[PDB]
Each structure stands twice: as structure tokens, then as C-alpha cells.
Amino acid sequence: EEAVRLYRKALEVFPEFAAAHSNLASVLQQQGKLQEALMHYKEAIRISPTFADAYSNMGNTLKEMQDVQGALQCYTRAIQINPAFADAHSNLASIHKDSGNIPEAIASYRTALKLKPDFPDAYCNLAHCLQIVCDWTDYDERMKKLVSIVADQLELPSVHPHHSMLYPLSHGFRKAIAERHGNLCLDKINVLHKPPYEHPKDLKLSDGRLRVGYVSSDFGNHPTSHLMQSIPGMHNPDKFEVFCYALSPDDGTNFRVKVMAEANHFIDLSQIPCNGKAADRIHQDGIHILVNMNGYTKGARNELFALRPAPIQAMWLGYPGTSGALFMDYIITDQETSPAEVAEQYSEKLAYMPHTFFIGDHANMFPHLKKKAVIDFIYDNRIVLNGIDLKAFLDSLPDVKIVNMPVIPMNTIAEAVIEMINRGQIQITINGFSISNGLATTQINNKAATGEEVPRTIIVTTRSQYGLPEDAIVYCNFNQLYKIDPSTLQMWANILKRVPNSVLWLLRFPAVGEPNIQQYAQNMGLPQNRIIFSPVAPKEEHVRRGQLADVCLDTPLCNGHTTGMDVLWAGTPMVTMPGETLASRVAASQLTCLGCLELIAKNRQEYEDIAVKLGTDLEYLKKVRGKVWKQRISSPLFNTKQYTMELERLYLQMWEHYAANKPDHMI
């Protein structure tokens, strides 16, 4: 704030001061004034045409305005002017990173570190890049060094809170990191001189209904909607009123459509870009509990929560960690992910949901996967059929043997099916029905593939489509590869050597980490026929293809979150080893809810034993599969209604307390 005042006087004193133009421009760029910022930077450059530092900071602004090509020309021009300019290289690399050119990002990060060898920001950024591709050279050094960089800075931390969970920090360190990010949001809002807000201490203006405001930049196609899209419309209108605050433009999707149609009030904060004016509106709506569903994730506008427009402010489901900030009062969680014992990682108090804070709209979005049929030469997972009108088709058939899983005998029906898969042709007609190839969903109905529409054909899923073997156990992990580390790959390799008849199924997420994974795998005595890769698939293909797997091996470091509920939905047991950080206790929470305590491992030996057991004790696997396949329907896991209602109980609980006392832990 006072920097601005200074600089304008510096420019009052002296009209022609290139550095102070550039300095003014950088602080206007902090407080969001991108156009004005950009103007002063060109003044600086007009004064001094070889001002590398302006060009580099101009590029940053252009990147923030989403002018990516202009930011490119700016960074390059600063590197031309001064080829040993460390920041131009760091910044350049960060564009390459956001475009998914990680090899070219890594190169430019290196070049920075060579030029200015103590440059903490660029080290941590490179370290995340290395994580993304599963490059683990000097891995132990790296980790030891990131703890170091952070140790130092604490006395702004160069490791992002959404990253801090992947590295061996202390929980004091992870909290501390989030604490200095939350603090930075306050320093942004205090510029606005805003008086404190006067909060309802009553429900009388609201007609006896609790006003709950849900803020998310992901009401649209993003994992957030894929999990909670039915929550607003399932709220009880008699006792609650729902306000949805989108932080992003309408992305066009049926996910966005649902939330706008179903909420009682939908407010687009993307056109109220000023945080003061936007937090004014939240207060004017009269919100009682305002829920944060971003934490430190792409889109967040935590400044809205930094100004305090609601008496109660809660974190929920979009952020797998602490915000570290005193403007957030609760975190909605459960005892199985955030045990009372470990409450002191979290700056916020702990609000317990009764089973798992995690939800999924799979019940609603993929209901063609509630029931299945298989084709013969019996295996539940080699050649699979799913359809809304599957039953009708089965009953159109001469012969079918229900074991309850219907089974199609190998006839001229099953020949035309498997030859479709064989040719890679899109679809066929049998008895007037659509029989469609699972590899071709986007061709047939795009919105079906994205999960915007339930599919309206019968879809065929086979291991042959993925190059999975028809006579061997399949392990999968379907996450982004960044969550695999050395230890984890070691565990999987162990399992793979005890179970000779097996393949571990991974994805090119990204494909540029595949050679690494396989290299490191082969250092552990594992041939290249053993780990299979296939590409990332459009949403519905993903969830469907989990049917081909036998068992899914969860990443202990950071669990499948969305990816977890995805695999459970296909009827595939997941083996997890819950760690310490909330991101490592999720798959375990989901399984406690689902009711498979048998799949939750206490340590590595336990983990590997569980999964080797599952891959050799075949009837134990038929037992466990059977148990998961029924319990996804019969347990609270996928039950958005039970979820919403119990969530409603927890909110009233939070109101009653504030109605009297200050925020305190919830059971």
C-alpha cells in the first residue's frame, strides 16, 4: 500500500526514473491492477530499452492476464538482453510447466540454478517438476534439501502448501507453510481499510433457515463437481437456504447447469473480481456458514474468506490439508482421516462427519455400472457389458446363466462382439440394440464420455482393448504419477515378484514419466512385460475400465481421492496404507465407510501381504470383490442423500455452538 504512495512521489520528484516505474508496476501487479501495471512497465522500457528486469516482470503480468504468447515474447527478450539472467530462465520454465512441456521446463530450471545457485523458488519448482515425471535422481538429497530451504525461510516459504504433503516435512512445518500463505491473503485485504462485518446472531431475517454459502472455482467440469453436484439440490429447503458462489465463468457443462438449476441462489463471483465488493455481496446475502472448497488450489480467492463476511467459516472436500489460517474456523473431516490425536496439524477445529467427509456422485453420474454381464471363453473382469437397457438385451438372448452376474456363452453373438473389438470398429447392432465399443464413447456421445449424460447404448469393455492379459492378475493404480515415489514403486515391485502371474496397470499421466517408472522398475529386477501403461481416458471410460482390474494398489504418499471413489465404484478392492498427512488417510476413510477393514494396512509388510494374498488366494478375491460390489450400494459411501442430511446435522451443531461460545471440535 505505502509502496504505491512512495513510488508515485519518486515519480513526482523525478519524472524519468525507469526503475521506479518498474517498481510501481510490480506492486500494482500485486493488488490486481494488471492494465495499469502493464502501462508503467512499458514506460520503464521506453526510458531504458535494455531493461531486462522490466521485460521479465512484464511477462509475469501478461501470464496473469492469460496472454501466454506475450509473456513468452517478454521472457525471451529478457534472456536475449541478458543471457545470464536467472529469473527470465526460472519464469520461462514456469510457462513451459503450465503448458506441460516439463522436459523443457526442467532444462530452464536447471539453467537458473547454474546461474544463481542459491535460488530457493526455482529449486522447489524443479523439484515438483521432477515429481511430475517420476525423476528420482539424488531423490534423498532433494528431500533433505527441501526440508532445509523451508527450515531457513520460516525465520514467504518457497514450497506450495498443496505440495508440502509430498515431502518429508514435519507437521509443524506443513502447518507453518499454510500459515504464511493465509497471512498473505490478509495483507492483500487490509489495503481495503474495511471495518469488521456485523454478523447475524439470529435466524430471524432468514425465516428460520440456516444460510449456507458454497464457494468453489470448480462448479463446472472439475473433480469438485464430479463428487458433490447433487449436494445443493438435496438440501432441506425448510431449514436451510443454499447460496452457490462460483469463482469461475460458466464452462458450458451439464455439471454447471445442475448446480445453477438446483441451488436456491447461484451467484457468479467471476464478474465481481474486486474482493471487497465480492465479500460485501456475501455479507449482504446474510450467510451464516460460508464453506471453502478450494483451499490452496487453482482458482482460489481466499481473500473473500480473509475479510470475514460470515460468523462461521469452514473448509470442505476440495482441499486435502490445513489452510493454516485463523480466518478458517473448522475443517469438515472424520476421525478416520483426521483422528483427534493429531488435531494440531490443523489450525482449524475439527468437524466430524459420521463416516467419511468424502462423497461421490457416481450413483447419479454412472448408473450404467450398477450392473454387469460377462462373455465366456468364468471371469468377472475379462470381457464386460454395461448398459441402461442391458437386462432387456440379456432377455433377448437364447441362453444366459445368472451366477447375481449374468453370463453370455460363446456364440455367434459373442463372436460379432469380440470381432468388433478386434477390428476396432465403433458399434454393431444385435437384436435391434446398440452394442458400442468402450474405446469409442466420444465418437458416439461426447457428453456421455465426460459424465455429463448417462450413456444410452450397451458398452463393451475388455482387457484386450488395453493389452491386459486374459490369464493373469491385474493390479492398477490410476492416479497421476506424481504421487508414486521410490518407496511405493519398491512395494509394488515386491508384490509383482511374489505374484509371477501379474501386471501392474498404470497410466501415462503424463506419458513423459513412463520411461522413468519403467527404468526404475527394471532396477529392482522386474522385466518390461510387467508394468502396463495406457493413456488417460475421458471420465466415463476411466470409471468403466476399473472393471478390468482385479485389485487396485493405492499410493501411500498421497492417496486416490476422486480416483479412490472411482475404483470403488467399478467394484474393485483397493489396498491402502494410511500415513500421517490427511492426503494419506483418505482411501482408508473411504474403506472404513465401505466396510473393508481387511484392506487397510498398518505398515509395508502388511500392505504387500494384503495384495499378494488378494492376487493368490483367488476365492478370497471373489469374496472381497463380492463384498465391495454390494457395499458401494448398501453402505453410506455413494449415498448423496444420507451424506447431505448428516452434513446438515453437523452444520446446525456448528450454529448452536456459535448461538450461545467460540469454535470448538465437533462430535
Place this chain on the structure above:
Amino acid sequence: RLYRKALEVFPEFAAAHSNLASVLQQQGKLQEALMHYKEAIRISPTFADAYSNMGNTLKEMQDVQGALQCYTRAIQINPAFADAHSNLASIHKDSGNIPEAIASYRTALKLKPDFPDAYCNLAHCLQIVCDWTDYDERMKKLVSIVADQLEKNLPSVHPHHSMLYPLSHGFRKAIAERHGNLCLDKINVLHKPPYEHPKDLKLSDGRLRVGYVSSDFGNHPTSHLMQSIPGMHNPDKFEVFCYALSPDDGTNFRVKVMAEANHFIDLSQIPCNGKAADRIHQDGIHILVNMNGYTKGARNELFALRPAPIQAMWLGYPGTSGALFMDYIITDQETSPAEVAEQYSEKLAYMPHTFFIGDHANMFPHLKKKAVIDFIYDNRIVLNGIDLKAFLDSLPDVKIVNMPVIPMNTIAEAVIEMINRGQIQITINGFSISNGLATTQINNKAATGEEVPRTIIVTTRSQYGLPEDAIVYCNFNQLYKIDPSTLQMWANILKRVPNSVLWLLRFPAVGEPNIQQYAQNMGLPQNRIIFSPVAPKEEHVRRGQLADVCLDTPLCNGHTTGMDVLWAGTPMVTMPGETLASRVAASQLTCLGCLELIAKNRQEYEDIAVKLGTDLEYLKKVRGKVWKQRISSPLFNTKQYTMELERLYLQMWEHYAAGNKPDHMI
């Protein structure tokens, strides 16, 4: 090809999967193609060629991050794979990262020195940043490449670049006939009959039915040129169909054309060329106009199927199409003299003055009139405003010259105080006074040209760092239009005129040190060439007024840029070449009535530009002549242009109505 028979015999045949995919992609079946490329890789997981071809297919579907992963994967499987390198580079070029474009094209060359497509592309990238190392080598090599390729049936030189290199005129038409024939072949796939064409004007109620086909109905120089046109056509005699090949981008340009054409048809919604051409035919179109040629967004497959009896190249592509499906090129006596009609595969159809037109009067009327400030120069401190007259009239002393001059007082001081302090706007006598550099913060639609601005705009030399006391030569085009000859020419000019600077644009910024260096190689210190940033459309035209003379690039002139400069009242020196692209500035100037600004050779050009920088009453005269004749000649007169454009349409039709093949119209 039924490779689908080949895969019938053998299911797990990776190569035919990759090949079917590459042929499905020919036809445009991208989702299907993409499907067979993942199959190819399911079978053979280190199949480089499929990963790289995959990339092409996802780059088409505009998944750029997807393409990158496919390219860089082809390079990790095989660091010696050149094709993958050339492709990787090509995406860098499209991201505007020209250095990486270059570093990557050379790797493709080092790996594979017989690589025509990657040499020619590298030459373009080099052209873009004005890197002229081994220029003559490069130039002679580019001909040899095409001589060789033309002799064995598809040039590695894009027809749109052909104007930029020393190719022959026979060679130009041939590169154009190739990309044209390629539109014909991609269409014969569909086996469609010839269409049955109208023969009189009877279905249409006596109206000629014109269809203007473009991808540039939006924030684009095409629309900055011809947006008024459809609305000025005579409903009694003409029925106007505008065929977009771009989704609606939300701009006013699109709104305007949508409101004023009689029929606006959004062909971006109909991706099939068969289905799209059938539509054009049933609208009963008599003349279908090609506004793209070989430019970004072309869908010339549309013109390849002949849905209309007369088909004319108009305004957007400054070259011949080489295509026998294009009947006339609308141009003029000065741009394409009949003497030199051999380049043109099309017959010549003449406009009376220029084929060139410009919507500047409608777009930028706040520049018809101007005020200056004192201590008399017309271009040191300038004011422009719809309400200038009233603003002036609110002032105590104003001296008229017709050019108002504000003397030096508290009023004149407060303006200068704003420019010095870089602040956004002020108020004098209640009138709104703005900084030329602050326009996107005042009104973003006024900045693009979508709206006439509503406050008064002050524009200065100090804003762009120009001398208050020296002559200013400008050129405002993208840097790729300059060549050695040209930069030599201007340097000559600049040494003859000690009080002068050449004012240049960062277009792209990374080209500035090249130009700076080659200049020094003959010229003077880094104070002779001033670089300014690329500007918002409006600031861009507006600030042109600060200059004394514009020096036009002979290799390819300002087209839109030519118009842009003249609209500010800045004279333009030009030397017409032999390609249409190098003649345009001279034709515009002929219409304006300034033939004394057209050079016959390099020497004349230097003499013209020197006289304008040293003779300062002759300067006042030609600046006067321009400032006036841009209103009174037919150059920026859209209504007159429209009418004679209508006259040439009828003249074109009546020839065909007599049962004739296309012939020259004069």
C-alpha cells in the same frame, strides 16, 4: 484405401493402425484417427512414428498440451527422430516462441539435411525475426528446393510466403496451383456431381445473389477493412449472404455484419465441406467471393466444389490462387496491370481506383480533425475528440491555422503535467481529457476500434520516446516485411538526414536486436532507430499522426497498415515491385492522388524520402495533401467503393449471362 481390409486379416498389426489413422486424418475424421493411433501404441508401446503423427492429429483438434506430450514422447523413444523434431518446433512457432522454433528446426536439419519442409519453415522463422545470416545462401537454396519439388509434383514454401523470397513469377503461380489442386483432391473423395447453376435473375426477384465467404468476420483486419460493405449494398439489385468460417467471437465486428447482411450464415457450425457447399448452392448464389485465399481459416474446399457460377478472389489474400475454380481476381489497374497478367491464373477484374478499401471513416472518425499545443509543429503534441470543437471553444485563446493551436498556459500545462506524470486522464472545463496510452483502462471497446471513443485523446512524441526537434520516419508493419535491401535503403536515407530517427515496432520483440545490429553494420548509434510496442488498434492508428513520413517496405507493403497510416495524414513513400503484395501501397496512393510519392527504383525512393525530411515546405504541402484528400478522394469512401463494386459484379454477371467463359474486365 481400405486398410480396414488389411486389419481384418490381422487384428494386432500396429503399422496399418498407424496408417489408417493417417488416412482418416486426411478426410478430417480426427476422433476416429486418434482412436487408431492409441491402438497402434497399445500393440507397440515404443512406436515413435505413431506418437508423432498422433501429435499432428491432436494439434488439429486444438489440444496443444496433448500434442506436446506426443511430440516430446517421440523424442524420448528416439532422440534421433527428425520429423518429431520439426513438428515440436512448429508448435513453438505457433506459441510465438521463435527461438525454440529455430533451435528445434536445426536439430531436424542436423539429423536429416535433406529436409525441405523443415528448411522452408526455418527460413520463415528466420524471416520473422529478421535474422539474415547467410541470407543469399538461404534465398538461392529456397528456389532450388522449389525448382526440385515442382519438377516431382507439393512445395515446402507456402504460397503466402512466396512473395517474400526471390522466386520467379512462373514459380509463384505453380506453388499456388499445387495447394489449390490439393483442395480439389480432398474433395473428389466425396464424388459429388457438378452443381446446376442459375442462368437469369428470376428466382431471386431480379437481385444478384452475392456470398462473401470468410473466417475473418470478427476482431480481424478483414473486418477493419470491409465491415461496412454488406450494409451499403443496394437491396433492389443485390441480395447479400455472409458465410462465416469462424465461431462468433463476441466482437462488435461480428455483431455488425450479422445485423447488416441480408443473410448471415455461420458455416463454422457445418464442419463438413460437402454439406456446407450444398447449402451455399441452394441459397441460389450467383457470385461467391473468396476472402481468405491461403490464409488462416480458409476452407477452399468450399470453392473447389463449384457451388456458384462466378467465383472471385477479393481483398483478403494478396496473390493468385492458381486454382481453375477461381474465375476473377478483383484488383485494379495499378496493382495488377494487364501487361503483367501472366501471374494470375484468374482473369483480371478491375475496380476503377483501388481494389483496396478501409472502414476508417466509420471506425476512427475522432481523427478527421485535430488540435495541437505550442512551445508551430502539427505532430508533437496532438488532441483528438468527437467533442474537440466544443472543448476548444471553452478555451480563452485559440489560434486557427484548418488547424487549431492551443498556446502555452495553465490549460496547456495541465495536459503536459498528465503526460509527464503518466496519469490516466484529467478534466479541463468539464471536458474529458485522456492519455493516449491509457485507453484499455478507459474503454476496452474504444481501444480495439469496436466503439468510437467518447473522451478527448492527447497523443505526444514524448509518449513513444521520440525527439521534439527532429524528423520521424515510421514503418509500422510486422518485421518480417523488411529484407536486407530495404534496411540498407532506410539506412542510406537516415545518414543523409542528421536530424531524424526511424520509428519501428516490436513485432515481434525478439527481432529488435537483429535489426539494431544490421543497422549498425552500416548505420549510426542506438539512438537512430526507436522501437515502440505493438499497440491496441485505435492507439496504433491514432499515434501514426506523430510521424512525418512513412517508409513502406518494398518486399511486401502495408496493406491494412497502408490504410492505417494514410488515415492519420502521414504520407507514405513506396516503390511498387512485381508481385501484387508489393504493388498495393502504390495503388492506394494513386487513388489518394499522390503519384509524386511512388518511386521507380531504389534511388528515387531514397531521394523522395530525403526531400520529405529536408525540404520542410514541401513537407507541409504533401502532409496537407494527404490530411485533406483522405476525406475527399475515394480511398476511405465505403459507399462509393460499394457501388462500383456492385457495377463490376453486374458487368461480370452479364458476361456470363451471355453464355461466356470469364474474360478480362476493364
Place this chain on the structure above:
Amino acid sequence: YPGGSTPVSSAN
């Protein structure tokens, strides 16, 4: 994913 986009949770 290759052809479409696969949205994910990522840092700001």
C-alpha cells in the same frame, strides 16, 4: 486426456 481435457486438483 489425449483429445479432450482431464481436469485435476492442482496448486494456485
Place this chain on the structure above:
Amino acid sequence: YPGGSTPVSSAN
């Protein structure tokens, strides 16, 4: 331009 888009004539 720096901050926005400047469309131009170009190859397909």
C-alpha cells in the same frame, strides 16, 4: 499486442 490479441494476415 502486449495485453491482448493483435490479429494479422497469415498462412494456413
